[PDB]
Amino acid sequence: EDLDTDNDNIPDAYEKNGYTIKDSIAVKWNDSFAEQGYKKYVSSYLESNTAGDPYTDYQKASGSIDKAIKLEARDPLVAAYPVVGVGMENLISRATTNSKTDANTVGVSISAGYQNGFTGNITTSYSHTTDNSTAVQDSNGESWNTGLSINNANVRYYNTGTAPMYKVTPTTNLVLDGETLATIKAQDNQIGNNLSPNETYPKKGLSPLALNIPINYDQLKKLDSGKQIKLETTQVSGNYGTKNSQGQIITEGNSWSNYISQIDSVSASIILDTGSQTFERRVAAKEQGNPEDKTPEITIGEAIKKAFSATKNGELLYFNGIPIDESCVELIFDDNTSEIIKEQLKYLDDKKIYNVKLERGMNILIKVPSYFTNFDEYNNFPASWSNIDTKNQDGLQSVANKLSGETKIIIPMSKLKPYKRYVFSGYSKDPSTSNSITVNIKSKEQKTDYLVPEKDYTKFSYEFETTGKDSSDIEITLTSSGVIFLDNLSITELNST
Amino acid sequence: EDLDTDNDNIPDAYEKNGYTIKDSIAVKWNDSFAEQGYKKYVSSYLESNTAGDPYTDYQKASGSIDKAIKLEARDPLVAAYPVVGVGMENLIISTSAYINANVRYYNTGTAPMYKVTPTTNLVLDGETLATIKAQDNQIGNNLSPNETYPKKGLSPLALNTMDQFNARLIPINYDQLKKLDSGKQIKLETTQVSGNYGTKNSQGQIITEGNSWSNYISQIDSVSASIILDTGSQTFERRVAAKEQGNPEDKTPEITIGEAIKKAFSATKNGELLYFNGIPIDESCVELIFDDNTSEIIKEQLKYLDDKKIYNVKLERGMNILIKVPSYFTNFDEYNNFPASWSNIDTKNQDGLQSVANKLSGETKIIIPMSKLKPYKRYVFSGYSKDPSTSNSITVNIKSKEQKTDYLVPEKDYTKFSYEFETTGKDSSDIEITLTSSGVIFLDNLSITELNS
Amino acid sequence: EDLDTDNDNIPDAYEKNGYTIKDSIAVKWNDSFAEQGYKKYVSSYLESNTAGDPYTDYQKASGSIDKAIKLEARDPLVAAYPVVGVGMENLIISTSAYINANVRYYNTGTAPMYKVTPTTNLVLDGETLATIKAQDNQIGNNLSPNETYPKKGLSPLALNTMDQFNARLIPINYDQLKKLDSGKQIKLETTQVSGNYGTKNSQGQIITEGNSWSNYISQIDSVSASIILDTGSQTFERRVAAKEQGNPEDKTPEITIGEAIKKAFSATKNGELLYFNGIPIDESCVELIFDDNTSEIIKEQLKYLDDKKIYNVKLERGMNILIKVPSYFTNFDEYNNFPASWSNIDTKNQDGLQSVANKLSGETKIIIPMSKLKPYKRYVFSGYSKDPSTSNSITVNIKSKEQKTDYLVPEKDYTKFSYEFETTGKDSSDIEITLTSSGVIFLDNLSITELNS
Ligand SMILES: [Ca+2]
Ligand SMILES: [Ca+2]
Ligand SMILES: [Ca+2]
Ligand SMILES: [Ca+2]
Ligand SMILES: [Ca+2]
Ligand SMILES: [Ca+2]
Ligand SMILES: [Ca+2]
Ligand SMILES: [Ca+2]
Ligand SMILES: [Ca+2]
């Protein structure tokens, strides 16, 4: 019970069934350590570094590594990985804001009905967080050509990873929405000495970092007609902190380029966006062919909670006081990822996504709803639903709203964003199999569609554009032919037009 | 009791309950040692650097570190940190055109920073004109705590290089000077600083070549709570370590805000009052300012604590704090710096916070000249009010850029009130402050505090 | 009793009670060794370096250091601080324009500095034109204490190199040349100096490459008191270690100011008289100039000491002391350098400071020519008077740019008096100094010294 094959100061028996660190030694995990705040760790007993990151299984579990690393990376299965980028601020004479998911959700196809079991979507242009596309806010309608009519860059580096990056020298190119111009590099005075997780260089409250190119008349027209400029990142070279026997943290020589193709090839990317700040986590997983491989196999639900440090109250996931269970989030998978998920779902009795295994190579994106209401404990709609009744016990989680007649919901434009397209999400139920549902949208895109609830809840998805700050109000019509059950209704924000 | 988990030459029993170093060996803390001048240290027995700073708990307690390190940085809870800023002394621009800037670096932390090469930003209005890094001409070989480079009595160094090997400042086009003539000024902010620190090696020398502070800025910032003390002319910035919220294996000691301020500045305490350099920093004698997150935590923590004082809240990880001593302070006991005496004041009382109170029968009026007031500045009037009757209404009339007329409801016990007003112009109308009382009211610790303009 | 806490080959019993080095090993101090020249050394037993400089207490005491270090730096309580500053000797202005300067580095410390790289500021009036760091052409390989680079007899090295490698120095516009024609001079000051020290490796050869002085500058300054001596034509800076006030764990020896001057200059003492190199530097025979902190510190400490002698006050960390030998000093015993003889002087006395005083009955008037005087300079009148009667008032009439007429009330015992006046213009009115006494007064140790312009 003391044998150590990999020699990482963790006995093999403890490492395969569960262990935790007390007083800098490994102890066998027990059910009684939960209420004390302890966590349960499981890793691979054949590898010193299960995740691939520079820090071994013992250094991460015991925390004997950098203190600027998130607690999320102390799990042996979660890789410490500084996913960084460049955020465009000034266009030179007009500022812009930057969307980290515009270039991902632009390639998502949305229909009305959905196939059984599966409740996500499909993306054809999956991209990471380093793939940054802007959205100009000071463009009030006048063209960029106005002002000269004759035929520099202020940026701010952003981190969304888990581990700090020292000596940050990002490399980007001016892709000018269709053709690259210059593969700019920041050499001597634009280098960030340190870049902590969920922080930018310069820190909040300082003027934008300036980096120091022709533009043709043709790009001027296209930029003035429904196009935006983005500054994609090809690579970023940094360093990281390593302890010593002398005790100093040495971050010269150590690179975040040696381990990147090691971390990347063994970890399954999981991404979550709260609408204001974006996170990217890598979770280790095992390849099917190799029998000697010993990386533990855990569900997505365990992978979600171990990556974003959520809380498992009951059976639903809470992240910073927000429900992030599989029912009130939007999952946007890539092509083969959905093939793996859909193929695995036929044999599962529970038929819930968060209970399926996790394999290396999948690209899961989680997009939290903008406004979501479940009639149970949480609501953030600025106006409540009309004709709300809770005298029920047939809800998806706790209780559903008896849609018998008509319910009106209204939300002003100021609570939304201009030049956007949304997704209407919810679940419907009607055991009678004799009542239909028709819905019409009061917006700049007006459409009416029919649908019928089934025995149990099923997801329905509807979309509409919101373009123009100074426009009319938004009203949604929910008409029921009889006794209709509704629960877990939400709306989201997709790409920008 | 001879164990040593973390290998830092301090037994875990002595490290957990209180210890001090006598003749380069650690001994158990005894309460009779405070009379010999010794201090009581408490630290965490699972970490070699409790604060994340380069020097371990043993080196910080025994004082075997750089001799320029302040004595309040010898606490294993306070982090040795250079907080280096660049202050602009003059600006020169002339003829296209050439701009020349004179700067003088300022250090405020508790550690010297050798070989400083700060990175500064040149910004006019939103746009960062240039991000300049220090060359060989402009590198400060030393910067002692609370000192400047060049030192006092010396001309500041000029900053006029794009790149290495003799480059020159130059605006790109005439647009900058065209808008410069409009009446716009240039600010100066630093994005980052690079320097060294010294460690006495095995050969007895001090090496500052394989060392840098950049390795520890991120670590210090993530395990410590920022605390600032402002004395009007001088500024101080410290960092005090604190335990993680939901961490079972974290052993960083829990201390209160008042104790941490005593530790981080080495301010003496004569029983209850806290004095730094003869200037009180007591809870009621100073105005505390917090950010968004810090205010929420204290308010939540207050309702569960019986004393209901700010200084008794257990310190946590991550808050931001600011302490600004009021510019003009009256307490009717030992300090009255107001240029003009107050009206209708009665010192015969015994119900004040410390020694006496001021019973007011009617109203109090004060005339403040603008001679000693900083023009184009924002000020906040502060004081304590007590009324056992709780049946008198108090209105305030303050003359400023906009006249302020507000009502105040006194409480049973002493309560702190804050009123903000803005005054613009040195040669403007005289500032008038008026307060009236329906009956008899008590006054103590009345102050006017400077704030950002 | 061979305990060694610091492990510097000096047992704690010796280092606390006094020790001296015999045959390169330490032996207990015995009072009979004074006649043979053996000196008494005392230092702190909790630190390898008591003074903080690169060399230990053993190496400083036993002399196993660089042979170019002065003798008085071999004291364990005196640090080996090199104070290097540049000397701006000449100007060359010609075409904007081009500037050329000749400078000569100076050393006035106790230890040499190898590979000197000064940093120089060219300040005209408020603005700083450019900051210059030493090039490979102007890096001085060697610099002995109380010496120069280049050595005496060689022309100064030119200063026309703007930046690294070499580019011609140039004023940026015509504006500074415009005000230069008005009569504005250009000043040069030293912001910093970077240099190496010299230690021996395990193989016996002096290696000076990786060792740098900029490390041991902050440490030595913040652990030692600042002492300066000016001998009229030269200056000598010395820094002496002093204990911390409130530390209970610091065991640094405490010495009087009088002994501090004796150690820091190796000044010989024949009982009470102190000689630097034949020039007396006794407290009564020289006047001292202090800063703010030392002025209030010294006054408070006097009233607790009966003798009331400056040289008998303990040295504490941080004080700044300046010693300026009197340029014109007469004592009527063995020295009188005044060009003109005094009036109404009687040497028949036995109540003087040392042997005799001046039995003045009436008034004394002196005529001082401008042949041996510096125009546009300030001088301070110093001397001692004794009047046991305490019934005669003395008024002084000193001619200067502003005529000075002040009254003096001498005390029963000997008292020092200070009077300030300014001399302007070489071809100006003759300076008249006259003092009158109501009765018979005693005078001794009359001094005149030069101050800043
Ligand atoms: Ca193992
Ligand atoms: Ca392992
Ligand atoms: Ca429910
Ligand atoms: Ca320990
Ligand atoms: Ca420790
Ligand atoms: Ca009181
Ligand atoms: Ca010793
Ligand atoms: Ca020693
Ligand atoms: Ca005499």
Side-chain angles (χ1 to χ4, degrees):
Chain A
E1 78 274 50
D2 61 336
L3 185 63
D4 212 352
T5 308
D6 49 351
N7 284 7
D8 57 339
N9 301 346
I10 295 173
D12 298 7
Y14 293 162
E15 203 157 0
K16 204 172 41 193
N17 302 111
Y19 73 101
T20 186
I21 291 317
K22 294 172 79 146
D23 190 2
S24 279
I25 64 171
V27 297
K28 195 150 70 44
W29 170 257
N30 198 288
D31 272 333
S32 69
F33 295 151
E35 72 265 13
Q36 303 150 240
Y38 280 97
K39 298 268 174 49
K40 166 165 162 164
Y41 302 136
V42 176
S43 52
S44 171
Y45 75 98
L46 284 192
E47 301 155 280
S48 313
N49 317 329
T50 311
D53 55 346
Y55 317 115
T56 74
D57 293 346
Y58 171 69
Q59 297 155 325
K60 282 150 86 69
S62 281
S64 294
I65 46 171
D66 197 304
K67 295 291 185 24
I69 292 171
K70 306 292 278 297
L71 73 165
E72 293 179 353
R74 287 214 296 257
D75 208 303
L77 287 190
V78 190
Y81 183 24
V83 286
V84 298
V86 173
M88 202 48 173
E89 293 279 81
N90 191 1
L91 294 174
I92 63 185
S93 301
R94 182 164 288 174
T96 176
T97 67
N98 307 268
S99 164
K100 285 182 181 63
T101 57
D102 182 10
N104 201 334
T105 47
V106 65
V108 176
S109 80
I110 296 88
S111 78
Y114 273 145
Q115 192 261 340
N116 61 6
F118 190 84
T119 53
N121 292 309
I122 301 299
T123 192
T124 78
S125 78
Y126 189 71
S127 71
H128 321 278
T129 300
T130 67
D131 189 74
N132 203 0
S133 167
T134 80
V136 183
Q137 295 330 298
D138 210 9
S139 46
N140 311 329
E142 69 274 16
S143 82
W144 284 85
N145 199 4
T146 55
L148 294 185
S149 310
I150 301 293
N151 50 358
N152 213 9
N154 279 3
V155 298
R156 185 175 300 267
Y157 311 164
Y158 67 94
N159 189 356
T160 75
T162 44
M165 206 190 208
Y166 313 122
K167 185 66 69 69
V168 193
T169 187
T171 301
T172 45
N173 71 333
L174 301 173
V175 69
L176 273 296
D177 62 11
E179 81 298 333
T180 190
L181 272 296
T183 76
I184 69 187
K185 208 200 165 203
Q187 63 271 17
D188 293 347
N189 58 346
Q190 291 103 13
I191 278 183
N193 281 126
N194 44 3
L195 187 52
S196 299
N198 285 318
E199 272 204 356
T200 75
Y201 172 74
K203 305 313 167 199
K204 40 186 187 300
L206 289 176
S207 310
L209 170 54
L211 194 143
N212 63 30
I213 308 307
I215 179 161
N216 64 52
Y217 200 57
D218 289 330
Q219 299 161 203
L220 297 176
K221 279 90 71 176
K222 80 173 157 213
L223 182 62
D224 281 322
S225 65
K227 304 261 163 171
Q228 72 275 16
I229 295 179
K230 57 210 157 290
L231 260 64
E232 276 153 342
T233 306
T234 61
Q235 68 176 316
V236 182
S237 282
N239 290 338
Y240 66 97
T242 52
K243 306 293 176 79
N244 197 1
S245 67
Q246 213 164 0
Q248 325 307 323
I249 292 182
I250 287 184
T251 78
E252 68 275 16
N254 296 115
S255 300
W256 274 121
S257 304
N258 306 319
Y259 307 91
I260 296 319
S261 51
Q262 184 182 104
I263 298 168
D264 174 75
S265 71
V266 66
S267 76
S269 161
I270 303 173
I271 312 184
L272 181 137
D273 168 77
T274 61
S276 301
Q277 69 276 17
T278 312
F279 314 81
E280 181 145 340
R281 306 299 187 237
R282 299 291 162 92
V283 188
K286 147 175 74 75
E287 53 168 351
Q288 306 84 298
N290 184 357
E292 175 156 350
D293 193 359
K294 291 295 186 215
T295 318
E297 184 180 0
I298 55 173
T299 69
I300 295 179
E302 310 198 90
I304 301 299
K305 186 202 183 313
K306 293 164 65 139
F308 298 98
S309 79
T311 48
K312 183 79 173 298
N313 220 337
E315 277 310 320
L316 172 143
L317 272 79
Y318 295 96
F319 163 83
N320 278 315
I322 296 95
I324 317 286
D325 63 358
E326 84 278 17
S327 49
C328 65
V329 297
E330 312 283 357
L331 312 158
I332 293 168
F333 294 100
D334 190 359
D335 53 321
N336 60 4
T337 303
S338 54
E339 187 46 284
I340 294 170
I341 289 297
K342 188 189 42 152
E343 195 271 347
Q344 274 188 266
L345 213 56
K346 44 180 54 61
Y347 305 141
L348 266 51
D349 52 356
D350 48 358
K351 296 267 172 271
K352 320 300 285 277
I353 299 291
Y354 273 8
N355 304 119
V356 76
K357 304 287 106 172
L358 180 76
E359 315 196 353
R360 75 166 66 176
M362 294 183 286
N363 304 67
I364 315 170
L365 187 153
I366 301 173
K367 180 90 197 177
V368 306
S370 84
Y371 292 99
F372 157 75
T373 300
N374 64 341
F375 310 104
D376 292 331
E377 292 87 52
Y378 187 89
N379 189 351
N380 44 17
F381 276 59
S384 310
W385 277 78
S386 65
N387 175 347
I388 278 180
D389 60 356
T390 59
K391 290 309 186 34
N392 190 0
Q393 210 51 50
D394 189 12
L396 186 47
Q397 300 316 113
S398 167
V399 59
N401 201 60
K402 280 76 65 182
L403 175 60
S404 199
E406 190 78 41
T407 52
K408 299 289 94 176
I409 193 66
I410 189 176
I411 185 180
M413 171 55 78
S414 86
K415 334 302 291 173
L416 314 174
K417 288 166 197 75
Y419 281 73
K420 306 288 302 316
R421 71 159 166 147
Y422 293 166
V423 175
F424 182 40
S425 295
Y427 301 108
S428 57
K429 167 147 88 176
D430 170 44
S432 81
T433 75
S434 75
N435 313 117
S436 162
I437 300 280
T438 186
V439 289
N440 188 8
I441 301 299
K442 304 312 151 273
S443 61
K444 54 203 71 153
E445 174 60 80
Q446 187 181 4
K447 62 178 289 296
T448 313
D449 202 359
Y450 291 11
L451 73 164
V452 58
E454 294 293 328
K455 314 322 311 303
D456 294 341
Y457 287 107
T458 316
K459 182 175 185 171
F460 62 94
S461 179
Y462 294 135
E463 73 275 29
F464 52 95
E465 289 84 2
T466 69
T467 293
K469 173 174 292 146
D470 48 356
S471 299
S472 74
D473 202 345
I474 300 298
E475 173 56 42
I476 316 298
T477 78
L478 277 296
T479 306
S480 83
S481 298
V483 182
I484 301 299
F485 284 110
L486 279 195
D487 194 5
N488 299 107
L489 189 138
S490 67
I491 62 170
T492 75
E493 294 168 9
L494 289 190
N495 68 327
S496 302
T497 186
Chain B
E1 173 155 319
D2 60 357
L3 73 165
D4 217 352
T5 304
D6 44 351
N7 188 359
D8 59 339
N9 300 340
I10 305 169
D12 294 8
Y14 297 159
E15 204 163 6
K16 193 185 294 182
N17 305 313
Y19 73 101
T20 177
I21 301 297
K22 293 175 76 146
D23 283 358
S24 86
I25 50 164
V27 295
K28 185 67 180 294
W29 171 253
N30 194 287
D31 264 333
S32 69
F33 280 160
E35 67 94 15
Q36 291 155 54
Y38 286 104
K39 303 272 178 49
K40 164 168 161 163
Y41 304 133
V42 69
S43 44
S44 66
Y45 72 101
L46 289 184
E47 295 178 354
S48 308
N49 304 7
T50 314
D53 70 4
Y55 309 99
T56 78
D57 297 341
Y58 181 70
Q59 292 185 275
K60 278 151 78 64
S62 80
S64 291
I65 53 175
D66 195 300
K67 216 69 72 176
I69 302 289
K70 302 293 276 295
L71 61 83
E72 69 275 16
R74 280 209 295 260
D75 273 327
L77 287 197
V78 177
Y81 210 41
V83 186
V84 167
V86 176
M88 185 180 288
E89 308 269 0
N90 272 319
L91 178 61
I92 298 157
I93 174 161
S94 189
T95 188
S96 61
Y98 283 160
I99 173 173
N100 202 342
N102 307 352
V103 298
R104 172 181 307 251
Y105 315 143
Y106 293 91
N107 188 348
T108 51
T110 65
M113 199 173 182
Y114 323 107
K115 205 174 190 274
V116 285
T117 180
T119 308
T120 67
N121 265 343
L122 269 298
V123 57
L124 182 63
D125 189 358
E127 292 144 339
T128 292
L129 301 187
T131 300
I132 307 299
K133 201 200 161 196
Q135 269 63 64
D136 273 28
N137 297 294
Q138 303 144 330
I139 276 176
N141 282 163
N142 288 317
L143 198 50
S144 200
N146 297 130
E147 284 212 328
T148 66
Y149 179 83
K151 288 180 104 157
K152 201 184 197 43
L154 297 173
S155 302
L157 60 89
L159 165 64
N160 51 5
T161 56
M162 294 298 102
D163 280 332
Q164 289 92 17
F165 179 60
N166 193 359
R168 307 225 79 73
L169 270 291
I170 176 168
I172 59 161
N173 210 3
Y174 316 100
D175 192 58
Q176 284 74 57
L177 60 88
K178 284 200 162 48
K179 62 177 307 175
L180 183 63
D181 304 330
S182 314
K184 320 294 298 161
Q185 52 91 25
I186 301 172
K187 299 205 70 175
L188 174 69
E189 69 275 16
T190 69
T191 47
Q192 72 200 9
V193 299
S194 300
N196 302 335
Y197 66 98
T199 62
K200 174 152 141 53
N201 53 7
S202 57
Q203 293 180 356
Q205 334 291 315
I206 284 187
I207 54 170
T208 75
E209 71 196 290
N211 313 117
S212 181
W213 276 108
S214 311
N215 300 324
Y216 301 91
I217 314 294
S218 277
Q219 178 169 293
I220 297 282
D221 289 16
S222 170
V223 303
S224 294
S226 167
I227 291 180
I228 297 184
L229 160 70
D230 203 308
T231 60
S233 56
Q234 263 181 7
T235 300
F236 299 104
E237 201 154 4
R238 310 276 180 268
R239 303 257 183 282
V240 188
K243 77 174 281 287
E244 181 175 40
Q245 269 281 94
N247 197 359
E249 76 266 16
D250 207 296
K251 310 289 202 189
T252 316
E254 280 195 338
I255 43 171
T256 72
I257 292 176
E259 192 181 348
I261 292 158
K262 174 199 194 302
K263 271 182 180 300
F265 302 108
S266 79
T268 177
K269 194 192 261 213
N270 56 2
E272 211 281 335
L273 301 179
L274 200 59
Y275 307 140
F276 181 36
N277 263 348
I279 309 98
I281 56 174
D282 194 5
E283 189 272 332
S284 57
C285 314
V286 74
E287 202 50 25
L288 306 178
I289 304 169
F290 316 81
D291 46 331
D292 52 318
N293 260 339
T294 307
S295 66
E296 173 207 74
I297 279 181
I298 300 149
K299 276 177 210 62
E300 192 257 348
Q301 201 74 44
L302 264 180
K303 56 170 47 62
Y304 307 142
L305 188 153
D306 50 355
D307 263 350
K308 301 262 183 280
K309 301 223 161 283
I310 307 286
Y311 273 28
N312 281 92
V313 174
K314 284 292 211 53
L315 208 75
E316 291 266 20
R317 176 192 290 179
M319 61 224 77
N320 215 27
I321 308 168
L322 172 55
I323 301 162
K324 287 188 69 67
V325 288
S327 180
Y328 301 153
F329 194 12
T330 181
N331 65 330
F332 292 164
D333 286 325
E334 286 168 346
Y335 188 35
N336 296 295
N337 59 1
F338 278 85
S341 305
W342 302 81
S343 65
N344 315 101
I345 57 170
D346 293 323
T347 60
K348 190 52 198 72
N349 206 346
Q350 270 307 99
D351 281 2
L353 291 203
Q354 64 276 16
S355 297
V356 305
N358 185 23
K359 50 183 190 301
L360 167 61
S361 191
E363 64 96 23
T364 295
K365 184 72 180 72
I366 180 59
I367 308 296
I368 188 66
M370 292 65 57
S371 68
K372 309 303 294 144
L373 183 139
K374 316 195 184 199
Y376 284 156
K377 290 290 182 180
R378 180 186 292 125
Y379 280 64
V380 160
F381 187 42
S382 298
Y384 271 87
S385 58
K386 179 180 187 176
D387 273 327
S389 87
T390 74
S391 66
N392 299 319
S393 172
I394 292 176
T395 187
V396 290
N397 291 307
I398 288 164
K399 176 64 179 67
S400 60
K401 182 252 293 180
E402 183 261 359
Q403 181 194 1
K404 190 56 76 201
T405 297
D406 206 359
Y407 52 91
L408 182 60
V409 180
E411 301 310 306
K412 165 53 161 133
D413 209 2
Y414 263 114
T415 302
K416 184 72 178 295
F417 47 82
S418 73
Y419 295 111
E420 175 164 79
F421 60 97
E422 294 88 13
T423 74
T424 43
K426 147 90 169 167
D427 55 356
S428 283
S429 48
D430 187 47
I431 303 304
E432 306 287 327
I433 300 163
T434 306
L435 60 95
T436 70
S437 67
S438 295
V440 178
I441 68 166
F442 289 166
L443 277 296
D444 215 2
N445 292 346
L446 283 72
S447 310
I448 178 68
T449 297
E450 209 286 337
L451 276 76
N452 47 352
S453 86
Chain C
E1 305 312 320
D2 63 334
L3 212 51
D4 210 0
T5 302
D6 47 356
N7 262 280
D8 60 338
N9 304 346
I10 303 170
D12 302 8
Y14 296 156
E15 200 163 6
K16 177 170 63 179
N17 297 320
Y19 68 101
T20 180
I21 301 281
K22 284 252 211 183
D23 277 3
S24 180
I25 67 158
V27 293
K28 195 143 41 63
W29 169 253
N30 195 290
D31 213 348
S32 69
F33 301 170
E35 268 73 3
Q36 293 82 17
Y38 285 99
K39 300 275 174 52
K40 168 166 162 163
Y41 298 131
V42 181
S43 44
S44 168
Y45 63 93
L46 292 179
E47 295 154 1
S48 312
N49 307 265
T50 305
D53 53 338
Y55 314 101
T56 61
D57 300 343
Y58 185 78
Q59 292 191 276
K60 274 155 77 60
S62 83
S64 293
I65 60 175
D66 192 304
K67 284 281 168 250
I69 296 195
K70 306 290 276 299
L71 188 153
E72 68 274 16
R74 289 218 298 257
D75 197 300
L77 299 201
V78 176
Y81 209 58
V83 162
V84 165
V86 305
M88 211 285 278
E89 203 274 357
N90 195 2
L91 277 296
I92 306 148
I93 299 92
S94 192
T95 190
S96 61
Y98 277 173
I99 193 68
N100 188 359
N102 295 358
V103 298
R104 179 177 315 252
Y105 308 153
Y106 297 130
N107 189 354
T108 47
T110 58
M113 178 167 325
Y114 312 97
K115 206 170 191 263
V116 303
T117 74
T119 307
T120 58
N121 267 346
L122 280 188
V123 58
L124 194 142
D125 189 359
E127 77 262 5
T128 293
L129 273 297
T131 311
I132 315 289
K133 189 205 155 200
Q135 273 62 58
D136 288 331
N137 315 322
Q138 300 169 0
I139 278 178
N141 297 344
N142 300 359
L143 185 53
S144 299
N146 296 134
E147 272 205 354
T148 71
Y149 177 72
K151 293 182 55 38
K152 266 288 311 196
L154 295 164
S155 310
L157 59 87
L159 194 41
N160 45 53
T161 63
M162 162 74 209
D163 202 70
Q164 175 186 75
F165 306 89
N166 186 4
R168 29 206 181 199
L169 281 167
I170 183 167
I172 55 170
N173 206 359
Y174 315 97
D175 191 54
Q176 57 278 6
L177 290 157
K178 284 200 160 49
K179 34 201 161 173
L180 188 153
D181 302 329
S182 313
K184 313 287 295 162
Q185 51 86 27
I186 300 182
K187 196 173 67 179
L188 173 45
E189 52 173 23
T190 295
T191 60
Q192 71 178 356
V193 177
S194 307
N196 297 115
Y197 49 108
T199 47
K200 288 161 197 149
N201 52 30
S202 279
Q203 294 176 356
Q205 303 64 20
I206 292 173
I207 55 164
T208 68
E209 184 61 49
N211 316 132
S212 185
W213 270 114
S214 277
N215 314 328
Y216 297 118
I217 296 298
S218 292
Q219 167 164 289
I220 309 183
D221 285 23
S222 295
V223 76
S224 296
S226 178
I227 293 186
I228 301 178
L229 162 66
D230 189 353
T231 179
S233 296
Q234 268 178 327
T235 318
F236 303 85
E237 274 89 318
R238 308 284 172 297
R239 309 265 197 282
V240 185
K243 94 178 292 291
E244 177 56 285
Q245 283 84 60
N247 283 0
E249 87 272 28
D250 164 42
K251 328 271 207 200
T252 316
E254 45 181 352
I255 57 171
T256 75
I257 289 178
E259 198 165 356
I261 293 161
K262 174 200 194 299
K263 273 176 175 298
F265 289 82
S266 83
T268 182
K269 174 193 51 193
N270 58 5
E272 191 269 343
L273 183 63
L274 282 175
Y275 269 12
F276 174 43
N277 280 323
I279 310 161
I281 53 161
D282 283 336
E283 172 193 333
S284 56
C285 315
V286 66
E287 87 294 341
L288 313 180
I289 297 169
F290 309 113
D291 54 355
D292 185 74
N293 271 357
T294 318
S295 288
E296 61 76 10
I297 279 177
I298 198 54
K299 284 213 309 311
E300 162 189 350
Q301 209 155 350
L302 285 174
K303 47 183 307 304
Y304 301 140
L305 192 152
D306 49 354
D307 211 334
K308 305 261 187 282
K309 293 297 181 71
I310 310 286
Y311 275 21
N312 205 5
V313 184
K314 302 293 151 182
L315 192 77
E316 291 295 40
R317 186 188 291 178
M319 294 183 286
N320 189 321
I321 302 170
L322 170 56
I323 305 157
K324 211 171 309 302
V325 60
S327 299
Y328 290 158
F329 164 71
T330 176
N331 66 331
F332 293 99
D333 271 307
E334 281 172 343
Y335 186 41
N336 196 355
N337 54 0
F338 274 85
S341 304
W342 299 83
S343 62
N344 316 102
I345 45 170
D346 288 322
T347 59
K348 196 53 197 72
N349 207 346
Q350 268 308 100
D351 285 3
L353 271 297
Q354 63 275 16
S355 298
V356 307
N358 194 16
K359 268 197 183 174
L360 166 59
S361 191
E363 65 95 21
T364 298
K365 189 170 176 65
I366 183 59
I367 311 300
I368 175 65
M370 295 298 102
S371 68
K372 305 293 290 148
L373 268 294
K374 315 196 185 198
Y376 283 155
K377 302 296 175 180
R378 181 184 290 123
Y379 288 68
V380 170
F381 182 76
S382 297
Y384 281 85
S385 59
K386 180 179 188 176
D387 284 328
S389 88
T390 74
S391 65
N392 297 320
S393 173
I394 291 176
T395 175
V396 291
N397 288 307
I398 288 164
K399 176 66 175 66
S400 60
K401 186 256 291 180
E402 181 261 359
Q403 181 189 0
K404 190 51 74 202
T405 296
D406 207 359
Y407 53 92
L408 179 57
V409 181
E411 302 312 305
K412 187 248 187 176
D413 211 359
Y414 269 116
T415 300
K416 196 266 192 194
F417 43 71
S418 72
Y419 290 112
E420 182 167 85
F421 74 110
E422 299 89 17
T423 74
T424 44
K426 159 86 170 167
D427 48 346
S428 284
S429 48
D430 181 46
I431 298 305
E432 297 286 328
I433 301 163
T434 317
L435 61 83
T436 71
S437 67
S438 294
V440 178
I441 74 157
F442 288 170
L443 284 189
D444 216 4
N445 291 344
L446 198 61
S447 309
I448 290 294
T449 181
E450 190 254 1
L451 276 296
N452 50 1
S453 88

